[PDB]
Amino acid sequence: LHKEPATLIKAIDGNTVKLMYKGQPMVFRLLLVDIPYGPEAAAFTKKMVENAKKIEVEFDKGQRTDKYGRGLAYIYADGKMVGEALVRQGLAKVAYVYKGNNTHEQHLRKAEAQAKKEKLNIWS
């Protein structure tokens, strides 16, 4: 998989962000991340992407857009995965694999177990 440059346009909520991607505005939905702490997840994602000096999009090997037109990707802010950071913080849960996009699933489930063990936020 490869990282591609993108520019933040707008933070929307915990797992949705509007990006300029290859010169077109596009809403992205973070792969493998579920939000059941909703506003807390929103605030965390907002700060992460707004403070980054570099935003990158990384499509998985599966379907790249959902039915609603949203890009389905991993988002990196300064080299760190936004979805993973949320899961690790106990601010989101790991979703079911959608259409073959499972490359970082294992890594996410680990982050999740650890947040769980630490009784963090939604695991409170």
Swiss-Prot record:
Q: Where is the composition biased (Basic and acidic residues)?
A: 104-120
Tell me the part of the parent protein that is shown: 89 to 223 of 231
Q: Record-annotated residues binding Ca(2+)?
A: N15, D34, I35
Highest taxon above the source species: Bacteria
Organism lineage reads as:
Bacteria, Bacillati, Bacillota, Bacilli, Bacillales
Protein name (database record): Nuclease A
**Where is it localised?**
Secreted
**Residue positions of the active site:** R29, R70
Q: Where is this region: Disordered?
A: 104-124
